[PDB]
């Protein structure tokens, strides 16, 4: 046994592949339950230095940021805050119970609990410090969990910064859960289905007031995707059409009078009329019965529901081989692009009450757009629903049978008259069929949330009139009603798609309105829209162009933001500067006054070269200089020693020496700017001086207040008040959250022979 081997480095062509789903396989959502309490700040022991610069026998706790990671440059800082907003929205919970995250305080009077692990860590650390007052220890002993179970409410202690309190309190007071009772189980189902006596409903549970439920955001199409987004509309339309085909029942018990086409037509018609997808016709003119059933079709289904050339060909054929040859007329002289379809001109040319009233009805058959229960609906005439249209049709066919054909031979008479007798011997079955289609159509329309617009699509579905003839010729005394499981499935699916649609709209609108309220000017508002379509797992994002995304952006700008996102963003707006004044890696500017100014006393540093008011000296913005490099101003002002300020995020180093003060180094940093113009290699010096600086004997003995050129514009940390930083977070106690809401309902149908329509009269009765 033996082998030999050879290989070949084939290139690796990778498409984008645009990973899809279909509607029945879209998973609804996954709730965000909260982890730890989203701190941004934490305390920390730092030393402290009394005025004159030297050190205490005591320490002190200051607020500092978690994860100093902030960039250089205001653009990248605003990127940071956009990402932070993304983090908060990624962490924004839907519901949260505090008891899951609570822990036990090891230093409480009553042996009580608190909210988070780090709170208790801080409490224990501050308890075990030697140099903390007794009052905070008393405080730690008093802070415990309180409960009032009459209201199902808890109040837990927390220790966290006021911005953090703002965020967590907003989550608490605006967590979207609502009390759940059986009335809400009912009222989540549509009205028309509860008011329909062909379905019976019950449940085997009595939910408590402790239950909860999340309400979907079933707000309508803000974007108007029927208006000039016809590719997306064709996609959505097909993607609902296919879903509609999945839920229509399969049917029960001479060219092409088979089954499998009756089902195809029964499925195709309803799914088209629910999806509002146009459909085109193919039909062989040697089969006249195809036309004779297309008559019925064009009657009971509107004409704007079809694409124009199809029904033009069908109506033209019908005229020129059943009607005008029977009454002894010319064939026709019809233009391709005639603005009237043949039935319209034929409505007025003939003189016969039955056919003319029929053609009037047919030409003026069109949907009724009515807004019911929030959703639009394309309701039929209320003469099609109750099957009576077939009586007009059959009267016309009887008044055609009685005609002679003065122009055409008797074999042709025999063919035509035989066909229309094959359809006239099915009066009751066709009336019943029409009632059945209307009923199933409205009943399935009731399980819709997204409004159903009437605009012709790019692409059609081929309907064969042979299949229509199969339908019209194979049906009798057996009724198909949609099973409640298909109904509930269709409704939950439309709900999940609609809620995904609205929530992702709200996402993209939030980020867009953020980015336009922060001057993020290099950013390109494409990837957001790509994410918006990716999370809608049905579109081909790799082959939608950029203009369409940008027009979608143009519509998205004008929308209001939802309440959660707008409030969180208002918080971030008012506190982004405060967050940025912290982070002692980068400073918020630098003054340059070619003059020997004084250093300010502080007590987490000692003597520092810090400024916190910026009055006096004029300020240069640096992003304007980075955008448009024109260094004439800064260069002229630096060479001639003119005082100036430089505003913009900037790193620094903490030179804790003293000999680098008398040597005046922090003015040396600017002479590179004339050689190399790029103000990126710019790091001022911060002259922190104290009893931990190796040369402090000078400041101790010689009695000189330190002085320095080139102060820094910066704010100090905020002192940690253990008493005032403690808060009480309020919430509910022990609710439950249910998502698949129609699991508690069991449902069944009446016997299909014992059905009934809007008129309170049995469908599928005529024999």
Partner 1 sequence: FLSNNSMVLYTDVSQWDSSQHNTQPFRKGIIMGLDMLANMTNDARVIQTLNLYKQTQINLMDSYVQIPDGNVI
CB of 460 to a copy of itself, least distance (A): 11
What is the token pair recorded at 4?
Answer: 């030999």
User: Stretches 204-212, 238-246, 643-651, 662-670: which one binds partner 1 (CB under 8 A)?
Assistant: 238-246
Which of 137, 144, 222, 245 is in the footprint of partner 1 by CB under 8 A? 245
- Of how many residues is the chain composed? 767
340 binds a copy of itself (CB under 8 A): no
**Residue among 423, 412, 430 nearest 475 (CA):** 430
* Burial category of 380 from C-beta neighbours within 10 Å (exposed 0-12, middle 13-18, buried 19 and up): buried
The beta-strand segments (E) located in 100-245 are 103-104, 113-114, 146-148, 153-159, 178-179, 199-203, 211-213
What is the token pair recorded at 255?
Answer: 């060219």
Partner from partner 1, a copy of itself, none contacting 328, C-beta within 5 to 8 A by type:
none
For 88-100, letters b (16+ CB in 10 Å) and e give bbeebbbbbbbee
CB of 524 to a copy of itself, least distance (A): 6
10 binds partner 1 (CB under 8 A): yes
Contact letters for a copy of itself, residues 492-531 (x by CB under 8 A): --------------------------------x-x-----
User: Stretches 250-258, 427-435, 544-552, 605-613: which one binds a copy of itself (CB under 8 A)?
Assistant: 544-552
What is the token pair recorded at 559?
Answer: 């929308």
- What backbone torsions phi and psi does residue 104 show, to the nearest 5 degrees? -105, 130
Distance CA 738, CA 745 (A): 13
Alpha-carbon dihedral angle through residues 260, 261, 265, 267, given to the nearest 10 degrees: 10
Mark residue 92 as left, alpha or beta (left: phi above 0; alpha: psi -120 to 50; beta: remaining): beta
* Tally of CA atoms within 13 A in the half-sphere of 745 that contains its CB: 23
The beta-strand segments (E) located in 105-216 are 113-114, 146-148, 153-159, 178-179, 199-203, 211-213
228 binds a copy of itself (CB under 8 A): yes
CB of 545 to a copy of itself, least distance (A): 8
Distance CA 538, CA 72 (A): 40
* Burial category of 42 from C-beta neighbours within 10 Å (exposed 0-12, middle 13-18, buried 19 and up): buried
9 binds partner 1 (CB under 8 A): no
Q: Considering beta carbons, is residue 15 or 409 the nearer one to a copy of itself? A: 409
Distance CA 292, CA 420 (A): 7
CB of 531 to partner 1, least distance (A): 21
User: Stretches 399-407, 556-564, 574-582, 741-749: which one binds a copy of itself (CB under 8 A)?
Assistant: 399-407
405 binds a copy of itself (CB under 8 A): yes
Q: What is the largest CA-CA distance in the chain?
A: 133
CB of 486 to partner 1, least distance (A): 12
**Residue among 325, 516, 507 nearest 417 (CA):** 325
629 binds a copy of itself (CB under 8 A): no
27 binds partner 1 (CB under 8 A): no
339 binds a copy of itself (CB under 8 A): yes
Q: Considering beta carbons, is residue 21 or 66 the nearer one to partner 1? A: 21
Q: Considering beta carbons, is residue 420 or 472 the nearer one to a copy of itself? A: 420
CB 199 within 8 A of CB 484: yes
Which of 9, 15, 57, 704 is in the footprint of partner 1 by CB under 8 A? 15
CB of 25 to partner 1, least distance (A): 9
Distance CA 631, CA 674 (A): 9
Distance CA 493, CA 186 (A): 18
Coil, strand or helix at 300: helix
Distance CA 608, CA 587 (A): 13
Query: Alpha helices, DSSP H only, in 201-325?
Result: 230-245, 262-275, 288-300, 308-318
CB 557 within 8 A of CB 528: no
Partner from partner 1, a copy of itself, none contacting 678, C-beta within 5 to 8 A by type:
none
CB of 14 to partner 1, least distance (A): 8
Instruction: Give residues 492-551 in contact with partner 1 (rule: CB under 8 A).
Output: 538
Partner from a copy of itself, partner 1, none contacting 12, C-beta within 5 to 8 A by type:
partner 1
Partner from partner 1, a copy of itself, none contacting 422, C-beta within 5 to 8 A by type:
a copy of itself
- Any idea what DSSP says for residue 561? P
Distance CA 461, CA 458 (A): 11
- What backbone torsions phi and psi does residue 463 show, to the nearest 5 degrees? -105, 130
242 binds partner 1 (CB under 8 A): yes
User: Stretches 9-17, 116-124, 178-186, 613-621: which one binds partner 1 (CB under 8 A)?
Assistant: 9-17
User: Stretches 64-72, 255-263, 333-341, 445-453: which one binds a copy of itself (CB under 8 A)?
Assistant: 333-341
Q: Considering beta carbons, is residue 407 or 459 the nearer one to partner 1? A: 459
Distance CA 598, CA 609 (A): 8
Instruction: Give residues 433-492 in contact with a copy of itself (rule: CB under 8 A).
Output: 458, 473, 476-477
User: Stretches 10-18, 39-47, 293-301, 688-696: which one binds partner 1 (CB under 8 A)?
Assistant: 10-18
Partner from a copy of itself, partner 1, none contacting 524, C-beta within 5 to 8 A by type:
a copy of itself
Distance CA 607, CA 764 (A): 96
Partner from a copy of itself, partner 1, none contacting 22, C-beta within 5 to 8 A by type:
partner 1
Partner from a copy of itself, partner 1, none contacting 409, C-beta within 5 to 8 A by type:
a copy of itself
Which of 94, 230, 395, 692 is in the footprint of a copy of itself by CB under 8 A? 230
User: Stretches 242-250, 397-405, 615-623, 752-760: which one binds partner 1 (CB under 8 A)?
Assistant: 242-250
Distance CA 687, CA 608 (A): 5
CB of 257 to a copy of itself, least distance (A): 32
Write out the residues near partner 1 by the rule CB under 8 A.
2-4, 10-13, 15, 17, 20-22, 24, 238, 242, 245-246, 538
Write out the residues near a copy of itself by the rule CB under 8 A.
228, 230, 308-309, 312, 335-337, 339, 404-411, 413, 418, 421-422, 458, 473, 476-477, 524, 526, 546-547, 550
């Amino acid at each position: 046994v033996q082998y030999e081997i050879l290989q070949k480095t084939i290139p690796t062509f990778e498409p984008k592949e645009s990973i899809l789903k279909k509607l029945e396989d879209i998973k609804p959502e996954q709730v965000k339950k909260q982890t730890k309490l989203f701190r941004i700040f934490e305390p920390r022991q730092l030393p402290v230095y009394r005025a004159n610069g030297e050190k205490e026998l005591r320490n002190r706790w200051y607020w500092k940021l978690k994860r100093d990671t902030l960039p250089d440059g205001d653009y990248d800082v605003r990127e940071y805050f956009l990402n932070l907003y993304d983090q908060v929205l990624t962490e924004m919970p839907d519901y949260l119970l505090l008891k899951d995250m609570a822990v036990e305080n090891k230093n409480s009077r009553d042996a009580g609990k608190v909210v988070d692990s780090e709170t208790a860590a801080i409490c224990d650390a501050i308890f075990q410090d030697e140099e903390t007052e007794g009052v905070v220890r008393r405080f730690i002993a008093e802070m415990r969990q309180r409960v009032q179970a009459d209201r199902n409410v808890v109040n837990y202690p927390s220790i966290l910064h006021p911005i953090d309190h703002a965020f967590n309190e907003y989550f608490l007071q605006h967590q979207l859960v609502e009390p759940l009772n059986n009335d809400i189980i009912f009222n989540y189902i549509p009205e028309r289905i509860r008011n329909d006596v062909n379905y019976i409903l019950n449940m085997d549970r009595n939910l408590p007031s402790t239950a909860r439920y999340i309400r979907p955001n079933l707000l309508q199409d803000r974007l108007n995707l029927h208006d000039n987004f016809e590719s997306l509309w064709d996609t959505i339309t097909t993607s609902n059409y296919i879903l509609a085909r999945s839920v229509v029942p399969d049917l029960k018990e001479l060219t092409g009078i088979n089954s499998q086409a009756a089902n195809d037509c029964f499925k195709t018609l309803i799914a088209a009329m629910l999806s509002q997808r146009t459909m085109s016709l193919d039909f062989v003119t040697t089969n006249y019965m195809s036309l004779i059933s297309g008559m019925w079709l064009l009657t009971v289904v509107p004409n704007d529901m079809f694409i124009r050339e199809s029904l033009v060909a069908c109506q033209l054929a019908i005229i020129n081989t059943i009607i005008y040859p029977a009454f002894g007329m010319q064939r026709m002289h019809y233009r391709n692009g005639d603005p009237q379809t043949p039935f319209q001109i034929a409505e007025q040319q003939i003189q016969n009450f039955q056919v003319a009233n029929w053609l009037h009805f047919v030409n003026n058959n069109q949907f009724r757009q009515v807004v019911i229960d929030g959703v639009l609906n394309q309701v039929l005439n209320d003469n099609i629903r109750n099957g009576h249209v077939v009586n007009q049709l059959m009267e016309a066919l009887m008044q055609l049978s009685r005609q002679q054909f003065p122009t055409m031979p008797v074999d042709y008479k025999r063919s035509i008259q035989r066909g229309i007798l094959l359809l006239s011997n099915r009066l009751g079955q066709l009336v019943d069929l029409t009632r059945l289609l209307a009923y199933n159509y409205e009943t399935l329309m009731a399980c819709i949330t997204m409004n159903m617009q009437h605009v012709q699509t790019l692409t059609t579905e081929k309907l064969q009139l042979t299949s229509v003839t199969s339908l019209c010729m194979l049906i009798g005394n057996a009724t198909v009603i949609p099973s409640p499981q298909t109904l509930f499935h269709y409704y939950n699916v439309n709900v999940n798609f609609h809620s995904n649609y609205n929530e992702r709209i709200n996402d993209a609108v939030a980020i867009i309105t953020a980015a336009n309220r922060l001057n993020l000017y290099q950013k390109k508002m494409k990837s957001i829209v790509e994410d918006f379509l990716k999370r809608l797992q049905i579109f081909d994002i790799s082959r939608v162009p950029d203009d369409q995304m940008y027009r979608l952006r143009d519509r998205l700008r004008l929308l209001p933001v939802e309440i959660r996102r707008l409030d969180i963003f208002n918080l971030i707006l008012m506190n982004m500067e405060q967050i940025e004044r912290a982070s002692d890696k980068i400073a918020q500017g630098v003054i340059i006054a070619y003059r020997d100014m004084q250093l300010e006393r502080d007590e987490m540093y000692g003597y520092v070269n810090i400024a916190r008011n910026l009055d006096g000296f004029q300020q240069i913005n640096l992003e304007e200089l980075m955008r448009t490099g024109d260094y004439a101003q800064i260069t002229n002002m630096l060479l001639n020693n003119q005082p100036v300020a430089l505003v913009g995020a900037l790193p620094f180093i903490t030179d804790s020496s003293v000999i680098s003060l008398v040597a005046k180094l922090d003015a040396t940093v600017f002479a590179q700017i004339v050689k190399l113009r790029k103000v990126d290699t710019l790091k001022p010096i911060l002259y922190k001086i104290n009893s931990d600086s190796n040369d402090f004997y000078l400041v101790a003995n010689y009695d000189w207040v330190p002085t320095s050129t080139t102060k820094v514009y910066k704010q100090i940390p905020q002192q940690f008040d253990f008493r005032a930083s403690m808060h009480m977070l309020t919430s509910n106690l022990t609710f439950t959250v249910y998502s698949d809401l129609l699991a508690f309902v069991s449902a069944d149908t009446v016997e299909p022979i014992n059905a009934v329509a809007f008129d309170n009269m049995r469908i599928m009765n005529e024999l």
